[PDB]
Design a protein around this ligand. Sequence first.
Ligand code: HEA
Ligand code: HEA
Ligand code: CUA
Ligand SMILES: [Cu+2]
Ligand SMILES: [Mg+2]
Lengths: 269, 53, 51, 534, 45, 59, 99, 77, 236
Amino acid sequence: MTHLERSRHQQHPFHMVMPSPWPIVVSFALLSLALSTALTMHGYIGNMNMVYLALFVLLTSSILWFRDIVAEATYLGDHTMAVRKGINLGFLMFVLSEVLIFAGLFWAYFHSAMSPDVTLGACWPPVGIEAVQPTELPLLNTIILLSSGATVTYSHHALIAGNRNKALSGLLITFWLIVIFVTCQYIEYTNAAFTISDGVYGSVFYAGTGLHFLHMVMLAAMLGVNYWRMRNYHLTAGHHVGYETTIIYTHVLDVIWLFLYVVFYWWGV
Amino acid sequence: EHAEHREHLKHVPDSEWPRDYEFMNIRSKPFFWGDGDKTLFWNPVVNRHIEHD
Amino acid sequence: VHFKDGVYENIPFKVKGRKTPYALSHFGFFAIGFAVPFVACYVQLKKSGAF
Amino acid sequence: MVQRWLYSTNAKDIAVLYFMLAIFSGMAGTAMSLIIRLELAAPGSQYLHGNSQLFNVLVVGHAVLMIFFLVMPALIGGFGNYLLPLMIGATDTAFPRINNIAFWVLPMGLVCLVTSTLVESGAGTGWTVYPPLSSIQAHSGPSVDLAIFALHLTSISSLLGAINFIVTTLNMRTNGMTMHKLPLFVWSIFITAFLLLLSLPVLSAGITMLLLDRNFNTSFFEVSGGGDPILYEHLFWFFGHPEVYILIIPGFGIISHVVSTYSKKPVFGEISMVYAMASIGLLGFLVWSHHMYIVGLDADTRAYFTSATMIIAIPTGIKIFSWLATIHGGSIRLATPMLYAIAFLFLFTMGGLTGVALANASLDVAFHDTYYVVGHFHYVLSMGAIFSLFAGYYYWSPQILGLNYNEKLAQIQFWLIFIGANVIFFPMHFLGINGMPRRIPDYPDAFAGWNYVASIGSFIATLSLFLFIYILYDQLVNGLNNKVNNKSVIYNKAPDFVESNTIFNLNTVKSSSIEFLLTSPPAVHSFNTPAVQS
Amino acid sequence: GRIGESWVITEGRRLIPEIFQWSAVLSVCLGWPGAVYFFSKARKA
Amino acid sequence: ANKVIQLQKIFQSSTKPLWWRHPRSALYLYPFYAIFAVAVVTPLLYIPNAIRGIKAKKA
Amino acid sequence: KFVEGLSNNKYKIITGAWAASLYGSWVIVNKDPIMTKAQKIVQARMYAQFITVGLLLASVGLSMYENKLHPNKQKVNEMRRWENALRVAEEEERLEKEG
Amino acid sequence: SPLHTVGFDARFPQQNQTKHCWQSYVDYHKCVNMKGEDFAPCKVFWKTYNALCPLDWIEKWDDQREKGIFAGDINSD
Amino acid sequence: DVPTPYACYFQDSATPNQEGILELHDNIMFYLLVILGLVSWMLYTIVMTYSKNPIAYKYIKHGQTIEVIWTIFPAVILLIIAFPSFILLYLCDEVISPAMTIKAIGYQWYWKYEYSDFINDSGETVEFESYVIPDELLEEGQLRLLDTDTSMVVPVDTHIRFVVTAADVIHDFAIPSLGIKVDATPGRLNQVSALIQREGVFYGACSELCGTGHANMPIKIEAVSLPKFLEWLNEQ
Ligand code: HEA
Ligand code: HEA
Ligand code: CUA
Ligand SMILES: [Cu+2]
Ligand SMILES: [Mg+2]
């Protein structure tokens, strides 16, 4: 084509982002959250009202940031294939950083488990603490993640194919499947013989399973956002990077749950 | 089975709950929310604080 | 909007066209930077002993 | 101007702000080093009368402030943010709001670290903030919680910058940059950004375990209750050695570039040098417990770690040998960043030799938590990372800032910091092998001489930084007059021998990376069009 | 080389004065603790 | 409900910044500005009460 | 009678079979030269974890297949260690008295 | 002249000895509760724990044994 | 034993372990000073003969012969350095057949020593808390900040293995003269051995951070002959 209407464009595929006020606001909110939760843990302020509003302003600033990124990604239309591969590799490295936090928690469990202290009775699990048996409720909420992975992968491969009634049905039932997982996980927490303070076993057990618990409620929020922008026709057939992102996230969450489940419920009892 | 077992250990008087060990129910500082001895999912049936008779 | 470029439009300090001398801001920056541990020492020495 | 400095998703105007917080926090940290070494100058309770808790607060402030708010910003954040897009031809970085939030969550870590040293006397543990010294029984208050929330925020900043750097040099390279054609500072920032996201997750996990067994009644390291404090030493030093390899690898990149461009020679075997640097990166995880030879490990695992830290020692050796090879046979133009590059080699080889004296698990029983260790790391961290930082500033800031500095003041600043910092940390070795422990307010008055000599040196090392501040001022208000009126050096690469002056004015800059071809202060959209390479 | 003063002599002349000044700069870059000990009262000054 | 091209035709053709360009974006940012200003200025009046050491009045 | 030695290492065989299962599923699914790398990896991971948690219950049946052959463990190995701890005291102090 | 002590056990040759004291204490209370209530050459265990682990640990474990909240139970009926 | 002003060497020998550590450090420094001398000589020769060099040999960028010799030379020197440290590390844990045992349990800003080998024929274990003399009650010749009112006293010419622990913050039992340094963590007992070869005093300090009273926490070990130690243990 003409040079005159070729030099009226970006001249390189990469993103040039206009100056946006959502690093500074969410950093302000992160500072206020850190100081208020360092200040209310010692009885300096009266209630948890202020750490509540600090967590809430962090949540609503970050959801306004994600509003800005979905508007820029599908309305202004800048996410070409180079930027798509960039944000894909960035999410891969972020999740590689999350699984190392999980590896640090597993290091804590292994170090205090396979060399048990003389104050635990020199046996893992310790004396008196009735450990959770792995075959009742752990079996349901370890088969429900495999069923969730199967239905989210056929919803993905129906989104690439072209049918809407299947690619929406898979996403709806994987959302309700993992929220049923989260609710029965809370059911498992609210009747268990040990608390987070009862020894080191309850401490590292609840640390690992609670971090996975918070990770899948964040996954459920991500999948609710993805179902909303799948219903409102944002997701295309070949430009769904914000959905490939969350299916990569839920499959690696499934495999880190099975690692956590095996060595937290079978070997550790 | 676990529900009927929790209904079995509902009506147990609290001094018949066994005196359990040093690592169980540690309290370095009191919890800043609640009365002082209450976690988030603290079931008042299965997780009693014995207060050492 | 591409922000216009020069020799003094790359830094947050304004240097040439001011009302106060630049040495005031440039040395007050490192004055407060060098005097934050001194005020930490003062607030820690009035809380325990004397000074 | 509010949208150019507060919102500002452009990787050139974020690095200047990184550098501003870097010089601010480095001034605060060296004020703390001056106060520490001023109180340790003589036995008996000096300037801070009694009050050892205040000295513990001052030494943790000096250590953690000058590590996580001067060296890591002014090497990773500032220099990577300004130069990593500007060497591989990206217009600027990928994920721009991510490296804006990294910068903007730095100084709130700084302000909560500052206000942690005021409430309920204060966090004194040292920068390796240990239990049960920091648990709620032996240390009560909201101080160390804010002191480790600062580490949470700095940890988040450095990881976001790491993901930013990794993707912006794995995808947005220019037309001809292959997988091995990048300049070596790009490779250093590459490997450092890998070690960040491979290391600091373990750190943040361990220190949030410390926080929720301080305040949330759990029992990770509270020992009467099941836990053990050795698990924190493992979970901390698994980051604690990759942290200083992170802090020193861009120093190796900066020194490689300045000795390449001030000796008119390419670096001797750049491919073997980057293989050595990458193996140093992937090997620096396997030696994390050379800081724990005393606590009660077996002799077998101690034998493994004292075997593996010497294979850590060898590729740094072949890097220094390649540096001697690439300055050999050159045409060395002794300007002020070349002076820092020459001093870095000697003053880091000295610290590395005393480091491999420390690395023997046999020999670490006579030297642990002892001023020999301070003499080692205040060589290889201080002189290493900050002589590379000075050889970064004095070499790059005429191109970035566009204002040429004064030259003779730069050389008296180099010789003052060189003399006045070699006189501090050299008596620390004699204090170490004579038997002085670390973190004491002061000491049994036998070894009363070397502390006085180190304290008379620290004032020289502070006066040289005051002269560096005046160098910044003289650069900022007399840049064009130092261009014109013959006080500076203008061409960093001299004309060759048989080349005329009328022929040097044709090809002015004989670079090998992009950065010295952009005009002084460069345009906000420098690479409109891509920068081709064969 | 082949014709000229020999390479042993013409590089010994270049390097033999360099060894003494190397020894001087190393004896004053590592030997100043001796000079500061020499004047103190520990050496019965 | 297939309202993406109308939103694209609106979002390309304006001068206002991106976080102010939507029609219903007045209900999302004014109460946010209010609650954010409140929520971040409020611990900086409780920090000198913590430096002085005076705790809360609880129980 | 082999159940003793290769049921002492349950959680070695399960983990090695998981790694070999992901490898033998990945080399099967990657031979289909039409899909993305990510879809192949997540399908191989799903097949692997399904066969692994299916084997985890086979080892439970095998675990009580061992438990009839060795009743009430963890408590009678402790007393074998205790007999070896009492013999080492008596053997030592008898020669302390007559040595 | 004599200064004899526990020598060198082969089970615990490492630098740590906390399992060595805890096992010697629990096996003293496993000898003198089981085979005979007190007459023995299992004074070796008494010599070993009273030589090795400190008085605060012995006092804490004996009050835990009295209250019945002992960690590794000593086969008491 | 005790530190000396303006000293630049080790507090001298008492134990075979400290003699081995001194010999090993001198061997390591002897192997290190060649490398330091040739590195400083290379740097000096280069920067004082190629600064006055007008041209630059820019066509020398690799050579495999000298590259592999300068990467195989540090491996050789590091093998020769690591060859005796294995011998020292594997002999300094050899605690076969010690004579008597000590416990050295360290509280907040003091130590508490206790002997319980039952030759004190009053019957009991013997303990003493070992506070520092505060630095105004010093009386005309007493070493500042590392003296003690109640010293630990050990015999000569017997292997003594002492365990160490704490009841709080991680301390360290550290004497540089006896070559003994071991972190007293509150959870585990850690044992180290000694064979003191001469009578006299030995001083040390806590070498882990304890908080406010880290400096006011010394170790004083007088080593006396065996009949005087038997008399002291029976009398005390
Ligand atoms: C970043 C690393 C770093 C650096 C550079 C220093 C440098 C100094 N430190 Fe140290 N220090 C530590 C990190 C560092 N330190 C750590 C981790 C500990 C251990 C704490 C513990 O374990 O408890 C410690 C401990 C420590 C001790 C031992 C005390 C003890 O534990 O008993 C002393 C005593 O002298 C001391 C003081 C000083 C002084 C006077 C300097 C002087 O050198 C300062 C002068 C430095 C400069 C003049 C550099 C230039 C400054 C700039 C701002 C340049 C700006 C340029 C750019 C931005 C390009 N600090
Ligand atoms: C910047 C980060 C950094 C770097 C690069 C190093 C470099 C090295 N360090 Fe250091 N070190 C620290 C950070 C660092 N250190 C810190 C923070 C502490 C105190 C922690 C605390 O609070 O306790 C410490 C203290 C410390 C300890 C802990 C001792 C103790 O506390 O008990 C050890 C243990 O092995 C050690 C060894 C080494 C070795 C072998 C190297 C090597 O990497 C050096 C490599 C360089 C050379 C080897 C010289 C050049 C090579 C040649 C000239 C070739 C010939 C050489 C040979 C053949 C050997 N140093
Ligand atoms: Cu005990 Cu320092
Ligand atoms: Cu290290
Ligand atoms: Mg230590």
